[PDB]
């Protein structure tokens, strides 16, 4: 959806709002945008550097910084702060999707 | 039947000889095999499969010939067999002389001949010929000593044929194959006056023989030069005495 | 989904609108199918009669052959195409006022098959038969669409299609349930049609030498129930159908059987008929049916 | 001439990216239409030759977004489209993408209901799983050779596949290898039950060679650089030296070492019945329980185990006694005289 679509909140439970089907899809797309679009000062990719790291040392973890995401999209950072039980699960899936986009067929490694 | 003392030869058997019928009443549509009868659903592709229950007919083309001495045209049952299968067989006989191998192509069936041609020339070239004749072809998993090899030409082939004989020593001291062996040694980079004249002439002769071999050995019929074109070669300067 | 089914459905609904048979000198040319649709709206009936001759005329009869050879396969596509056509023009009659079932009947087939002419290669195809009515049963309801009550999270699923045999709703009113072991049917949300079985018999003139008479069971589904009295010669038009038979257990010949565990099931059947409609062969009504 | 301007270096340009997100009111079916137009737009530059990247970078000029193509008209803080002005990195809309594609005009793609039906006569109905499995066709698994009609109108000519296990021995590959052998044998066959170094074989070959020395010398004398025989009529020999080993040198080395049917067959059909396929599985050896003139007599259209009995067969004798079969031959026979 839109950035302000997440801002307009209407649900009885905060985690239910996060896991609202349309809202959940919006969260997935917005996280995809945050990871694919955010770039360092010198034009070097932040998430590009992280995926370059992951491709060669083949770890099962990615060191995603909270501050850069916060100045990227405040609503998603606040969703993480209030209800990290659900967004992290989505963020793992979108991270895997982006890794496949850069390095396809990563199932055997991890 | 060739006589050496006369130095001349004549053809005799015409047993399977066929009179060229009226082919029709560019070259891509010359022989994609759509001629005479049968002339002029998507989403399903049998690229990597053979039907379990087969409900279709085979090509019905003449297969007359010999064990070996058979052209790619007839070998793959390619329609509208042309006269140039004969010159292909001629080139096969020619190559049999250059290498001293009489049973040059021991083909117990069509498959043997096709695989032997694949060995000599290459999978890609044979596939290209089949595609030219509107025919799909595929082969994988098989191991070849020359994987799409011998692309240098037939020179390397007759070269290692003679190489193993040289290492063994099959040929006699007076065998005339040794001059050819030296020719390939020199060209592959791998009193005396009469000697130098003689070797110069044999350089030229072997040269022209090897560039008429590749002239005849080409899968394309339309590109394959006719018998008169073969006779017009610079190798055939002895007809010029007329 | 099937591309061919979509093609035949779209062609069906296309010529339900584009078709127009001439009225010769008197009346110019009119849309016969649209005229019948207007008649349907006027009289609020439930069955549409389609001549097979017109379908044969249209598009060199390729579609006619396709629908005659595989009528059963294309029948749902026919229903969907007719529903969309009704939606296009006069969609008021779409609903019962929950949903009104539209019946399609084909009439005037080129040929007539006698009861002894029944063949297995015609199973599922469209044809016509001519016999004498021997036994007629009561008009009984049949489960057009069936609703049930759930086992875990006891609740009622509403308006689920019922096939030729008993069906269990894979989905549940509660999406989290996904349990279907024990369903309890409810008549309120279960649709019904009219069912009646008529045992026809071969006419005398068609009997071969020595053979004793042969007979067939014909099912009349829809408004055509109780349309024929016993002892009358009627022409039945419908689809050739098969029904499971348990009696032919000792007959000669290998019995087809399905193995699945074990999953054994004897695939023994007997031939029957499902007829779209039936045609038989004061002084005012009498005076009307004269030239 | 803009196409030439836009066919100049983008074949060498290596940076391609396409923006995904946008701020619009889009429905699920509208989402699907967006996805299909997005994949078409991706394919538009997929074959262009310019490599595509998945990340937004200040290097990648190609970036297309539907809305806010420098259309925000205001400062933004966390927008790539806010940086698009400062980085100069080009941006269009998808409608503007089609506007520019009008310069390119790339095709959208690179009915006969009766034909559809009688084609579904083949393959069965087309409503199957779009996968590599149909069970109606033996898909190739092992090393194989396959040659097929391009239009699949005729049956495949050669279709042979071999299990890996039977390929264990290199000597008897079903497809022969270029095992050259020696002594002028077939290049695809070798010295089976033969050894070129076997001293008895060497002696036999040496004796045969020395027997034929004079004949080979006569051949060379007859044929030496004059391109003709009668023209050659009026120096004895020319020997070009070589480092090659021959029969004589190898023989000297060894001596030093030891010093201390018919051709015709009946025409056969192509299609084999399914019952034939079933029968062919149950095949076992014939030893359980119960001269060379064997061939096919096309005159009698019959296959004979023995010729001497076929010639005396009743049908063949009757055929021979009928001159009506040879009338055309006699017509040209008499024309000789
Ligand atoms: Mg002969
Ligand atoms: Mg002959
Ligand atoms: Zn051809
Ligand atoms: Zn439930
Ligand atoms: Zn005979």
Chain D hits for A21, Cβ within 8 Å: none
- State the Cα–Cα distance between residues D325 and D106, nearest whole angstrom: 67
Closest ligand, as measured to the CA of C152: 4
Domain count, chain C: 3
* Cβ distance of D126 and C3 shorter than 8 Å: yes
- Residue D92, CA atoms < 13 Å, CB-side half-sphere: 13
- DSSP string covering D92-159, please? E-HHHHHHHHHHH---S----HHHHHHHHTSSS-S-S-SSS--SSEEE--SSEEEEEETT--S--SEE
Task: Judge whether C279 is closer than 8 Å to chain D, CB to CB.
Answer: no
Does residue C120 share a domain with residue C51?
A: no
D118 in a labelled binding site: no
Q: Which of C270, C194, C201, C192 is nearest to C231 (CA)?
A: C201
* Cβ-proximal residues to D109 (8 Å cutoff; 6+ apart), any chain: none
Chain B hits for D246, Cβ within 8 Å: 169-173, 175
* Cβ-proximal residues to A60 (8 Å cutoff; 6+ apart), any chain: A110
Chain D hits for C11, Cβ within 8 Å: 113
Q: Is residue C234 part of a domain?
A: yes
Task: Judge whether D225 is closer than 8 Å to chain B, CB to CB.
Answer: yes
Does residue C272 share a domain with residue C129?
A: yes
Longest CA–CA span in chain B (Å) reads 77
* Cβ-proximal residues to D21 (8 Å cutoff; 6+ apart), any chain: A29, A30, A32, A33, D65
To test the contact with chain B by mutation, choose from D174, D240, D250, D271 the residue with the greatest count of B C-beta atoms within 10 A, namely D240
Instruction: State the residue range of the domain holding C122.
Output: 112-140+194-245+268-281
First CA to last CA across chain D, in angstroms?
A: 81
Strand (E) or helix (H) holding C220: strand C215-221
Does residue C117 share a domain with residue C203?
A: yes
Does residue C167 share a domain with residue C231?
A: no
Chain D hits for B104, Cβ within 8 Å: 186-187
Q: Ligand 2 centroid to D328 CA: how many Å? A: 20
- Tell me which residues of chain B, numbers 108 to 147, contact chain D at a CB-CB cutoff of 8 Å: 110-112, 114-116, 119, 130-131, 134-142, 145-146
> D98-129: buried (b, 16+ CB within 10 Å) or exposed (e) per residue?
eeeeeeeeeeeeeeeeeebbeeeeebeebeee
| Closest chain D residue to B111, measured at CA | D158
Q: Is residue C200 part of a domain?
A: yes
Alpha helices in B40-191 (DSSP H): 72-75, 84-97, 110-120, 123-132, 154-168, 177-187
Chain A hits for D21, Cβ within 8 Å: 29-30, 32-33
To test the contact with chain D by mutation, choose from B6, B39, B42, B51 the residue with the greatest count of D C-beta atoms within 10 A, namely B51
Contact residues, chain A to chain D, C-beta under 8 Å: 2-3, 29-30, 32-33, 36-37, 39, 43-45, 47-48, 71-73, 98, 101-102
Instruction: State the residue range of the domain holding A45.
Output: 21-110
CA distance B22 to chain D (A): 23
* Nearest CB partner across the interface for B58, out of D135, D157, D239: D157
Q: Is residue A5 part of a domain?
A: no
* Cβ distance of A36 and D55 shorter than 8 Å: yes
- State the Cα–Cα distance between residues C85 and B60, nearest whole angstrom: 52
* Cβ distance of D56 and A36 shorter than 8 Å: yes
First CA to last CA across chain C, in angstroms?
A: 52
- Are the C-beta atoms of C29 and C84 separated by less than 8 Å? no
Q: Kindly list the partner chains of chain B, i.e. chains with 3 or more CB atom pairs below 8 Å.
A: D
Task: Judge whether C64 is closer than 8 Å to chain D, CB to CB.
Answer: no
The total number of residues written for chain D in this structure: 337
Q: Is C288 helix (H, G, I), strand (E, B) or coil?
A: helix
For A14, B130, B234, the CA distances from B204, given in Å and listed in that order, are 92, 35, 10
Q: Is residue A43 part of a domain?
A: yes
The C-alpha R_g of chain A, in whole angstroms, comes to: 15
Does residue C164 share a domain with residue C123?
A: no
For A107, B104, B179, B235, the CA distances from B120, given in Å and listed in that order, are 43, 12, 23, 24
Does residue C276 share a domain with residue C133?
A: yes
The residue numbers preceding gaps of C to N over 2.5 A in chain D are 110, 234, 260, 290
| Closest chain D residue to A27, measured at CA | D21
D186 in a labelled binding site: no
Answer with the one of C131, C159, C193 that is the final residue of a domain. C193
- State the Cα–Cα distance between residues D180 and D172, nearest whole angstrom: 14
For residue D251, count other CB atoms closer than 10 A to its CB. 18
- State the Cα–Cα distance between residues C287 and C284, nearest whole angstrom: 5
The CB-based long-range contact list for D191-196 (8 Å cut-off, 24+ gap) reads D196/B168, D196/B170
Q: Would you give the DSSP letter of residue C285?
A: H
- State the Cα–Cα distance between residues D80 and B182, nearest whole angstrom: 71
Q: Is residue A11 part of a domain?
A: no
| Closest chain A residue to D57, measured at CA | A43
Identify the CATH number of the domain in which residue C237 sits. Answer: 2.40.50.140
Q: Is residue C276 part of a domain?
A: yes
* Cβ distance of D176 and B106 shorter than 8 Å: yes
Does residue C148 share a domain with residue C48?
A: no
The coordinates were experimentally obtained by: cryo-EM
Q: Is residue C259 part of a domain?
A: no
Q: Is residue C1 part of a domain?
A: yes
Q: Is residue A62 part of a domain?
A: yes
- State the Cα–Cα distance between residues A64 and A40, nearest whole angstrom: 14
Q: Is C51 helix (H, G, I), strand (E, B) or coil?
A: strand
Task: Judge whether D145 is closer than 8 Å to chain B, CB to CB.
Answer: yes
- State the Cα–Cα distance between residues B128 and B136, nearest whole angstrom: 9
Q: Which of C194, C208, C191 is nearest to C277 (CA)?
A: C194
Task: Judge whether B218 is closer than 8 Å to chain D, CB to CB.
Answer: no
Does residue C133 share a domain with residue C272?
A: yes
Chain D hits for C3, Cβ within 8 Å: 126-127
Does residue C226 share a domain with residue C85?
A: no
The C-alpha R_g of chain C, in whole angstroms, comes to: 22
Q: Ligand 1 centroid to B70 CA: how many Å? A: 15
Domain count, chain A: 1
Identify the CATH number of the domain in which residue A110 sits. Answer: 3.30.1640.10
D300 in a labelled binding site: yes
- State the Cα–Cα distance between residues C148 and C158, nearest whole angstrom: 7
Does residue C167 share a domain with residue C74?
A: no
Does residue C180 share a domain with residue C235?
A: no
Q: Do chains B and A touch by CB distance (3+ pairs < 8 Å)?
A: no
Does residue C201 share a domain with residue C182?
A: no
- State the Cα–Cα distance between residues A95 and A50, nearest whole angstrom: 11
- Are the C-beta atoms of C121 and C66 separated by less than 8 Å? no
- Are the C-beta atoms of A17 and A11 separated by less than 8 Å? yes
Identify the CATH number of the domain in which residue C23 sits. Answer: 3.30.1640.10
Contact residues, chain D to chain A, C-beta under 8 Å: 20-21, 23-24, 54-59, 78, 80, 87
Q: Is residue C134 part of a domain?
A: yes
């Amino acid at each position: 959806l839109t950035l302000e679509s997440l801002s307009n909140v209407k649900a009885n439970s905060y985690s239910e709002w996060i896991t609202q089907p349309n809202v959940s899809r919006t969260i997935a797309r917005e996280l995809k945008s945050f990871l694919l679009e955010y770039t360092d000062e010198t034009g070097r990719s932040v998430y590009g550097a992280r995926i370059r790291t992951l491709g060669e040392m083949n770890s099962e973890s990615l060191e995603v910084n909270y501050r850069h995401l916060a100045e990227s999209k405040a609503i998603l950072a606040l969703f993480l702060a209030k209800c990290p039980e659900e967004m992290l699960k989505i963020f793992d899936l979108v991270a895997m999707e982006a890794t496949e986009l850069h390095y396809p067929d990563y199932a055997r490694i991890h | 039947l060739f006589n050496l003392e006369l130095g001349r030869g004549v053809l005799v058997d015409f047993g399977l000889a066929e009179a060229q019928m009226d082919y029709k009443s560019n070259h891509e549509q010359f022989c994609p095999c759509i001629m005479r009868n049968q002339y002029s659903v998507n989403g399903v592709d049998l690229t990597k499969g053979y039907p379990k229950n087969e409900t279709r007919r085979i090509k019905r083309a003449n297969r007359a010939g010999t064990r070996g001495f058979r052209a790619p045209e007839v070998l793959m049952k390619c329609g509208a067999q042309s006269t140039k299968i004969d010159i292909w067989s001629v080139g096969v006989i020619l190559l049999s002389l250059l290498g001293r191998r009489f049973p040059m192509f021991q083909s117990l069936d069509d498959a043997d001949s096709l695989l032997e041609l694949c060995t000599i020339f290459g999978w890609k070239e044979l596939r290209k010929c089949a595609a030219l004749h509107g025919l799909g072809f595929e082969a994988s998993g098989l191991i070849w000593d020359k994987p799409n090899g011998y692309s240098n030409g037939l020179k390397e082939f007759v070269y290692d044929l003679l190489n193993k004989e040289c290492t063994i020593g099959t040929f006699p001291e007076y065998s005339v194959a040794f001059e050819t062996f030296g020719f390939l040694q020199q060209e592959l980079h791998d009193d005396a006056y009469e000697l130098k004249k003689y070797q110069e002439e044999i350089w030229s002769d072997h040269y022209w023989c090897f560039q008429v071999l590749e002239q005849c050995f080409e899968m394309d019929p339309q590109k394959r030069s006719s018998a008169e074109d073969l006779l017009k070669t610079p190798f055939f300067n002895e007809l010029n005495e007329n | 989904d099937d591309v061919t089914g979509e093609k035949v459905r779209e062609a069906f609904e296309q010529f339900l609108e584009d078709f127009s048979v001439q009225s010769t000198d008197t009346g110019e040319v009119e849309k016969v199918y649209r005229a019948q649709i207007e008649f349907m709206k006027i009289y609020d009936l439930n069955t549409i009669y389609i001549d097979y001759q017109h379908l044969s005329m249209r598009e060199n009869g390729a579609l006619a052959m396709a629908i005659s050879e595989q009528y059963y396969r294309f029948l749902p596509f026919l229903q969907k195409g007719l529903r969309r056509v009704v939606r296009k023009y006069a969609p008021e009659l779409l609903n019962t006022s929950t949903e009104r079932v539209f019946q399609i009947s084909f009439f005037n087939l080129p040929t007539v098959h006698r009861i002894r002419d029944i063949r297995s290669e015609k199973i599922g195809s469209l044809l016509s038969i001519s016999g004498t009515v021997t036994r007629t049963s009561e008009v009984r309801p049949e489960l057009y669409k069936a609703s049930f009550t759930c086992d875990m999270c006891r609740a009622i699923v509403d308006n689920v299609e019922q096939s030729f045999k008993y069906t269990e709703p894979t989905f549940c009113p509660n999406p989290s349930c996904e349990n279907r072991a024990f369903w309890t049917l409810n008549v309120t949300r279960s649709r019904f049609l009219d069912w009646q079985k008529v045992r026809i018999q071969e006419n005398a003139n068609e009997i071969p030498t020595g053979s004793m008479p042969r007979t067939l069971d014909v099912i009349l589904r829809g408004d055509s129930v109780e349309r024929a009295k016993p002892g009358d010669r009627c022409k039945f038009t419908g689809v050739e159908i098969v029904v499971p038979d348990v009696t032919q257990l000792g007959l000669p010949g290998v019995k087809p059987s399905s193995t699945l565990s074990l999953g054994v099931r004897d695939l023994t059947y007997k031939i029957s008929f499902l007829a779209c409609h039936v045609i038989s062969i004061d002084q005012e009504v009498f005076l009307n049916s004269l030239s | 001439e803009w196409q030439t301007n836009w066919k100049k270096i983008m074949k060498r340009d290596s940076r391609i990216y396409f923006d995904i997100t946008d701020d619009v009111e889009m429905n699920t079916y509208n989402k699907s239409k967006m996805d299909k137009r997005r994949d078409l737009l991706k394919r538009g530059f997929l074959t262009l030759g310019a490599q595509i990247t998945q990340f937004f970078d200040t290097t990648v000029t190609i970036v297309i977004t539907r809305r806010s193509v420098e259309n925000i008209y205001l400062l933004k803080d966390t927008d790539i489209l806010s940086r698009a002005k400062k980085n100069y990195m080009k941006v269009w809309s998808y409608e503007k993408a089609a506007r520019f594609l009008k310069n390119l005009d790339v095709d959208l793609d690179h009915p006969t209901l009766s034909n559809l039906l009688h084609n579904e006569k083949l393959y069965g109905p087309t409503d199957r799983d779009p996968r590599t499995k149909r069970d109606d066709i033996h898909y190739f698994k092992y090393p194989h050779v396959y040659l097929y009609d391009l239009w699949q109108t005729w049956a495949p000519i050669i279709t042979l596949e071999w299990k890996p296990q039977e390929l264990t021995n290199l000597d008897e590959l079903p497809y022969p290898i270029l095992k050259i052998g020696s002594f002028g044998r077939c290049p695809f066959i070798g010295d089976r039950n033969y050894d070129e170094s076997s001293y008895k074989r060497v002696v036999k070959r040496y004796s045969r060679d020395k027997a034929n020395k004079k004949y080979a010398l006569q051949l060379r004398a007859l044929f030496q650089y004059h391109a003709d025989t009668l023209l050659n009529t009026s120096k004895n020999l020319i020997f070009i030296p070589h480092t090659c080993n021959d029969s004589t040198k190898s023989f000297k080395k060894w001596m030093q070492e030891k010093a201390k049917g018919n051709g015709l067959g009946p025409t056969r059909a192509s299609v084999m019945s399914k019952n034939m396929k079933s029968l062919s599985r149950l095949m076992v050896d014939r030893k359980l329980g119960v001269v060379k003139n064997s061939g096919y007599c096309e005159n009698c259209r019959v296959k004979y185990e023995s010729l001497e009995q076929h010639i005396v067969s009743e049908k063949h004798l009757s055929f021979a006694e009928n001159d009506l079969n040879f009338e055309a031959i006699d017509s040209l026979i008499e024309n000789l005289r």
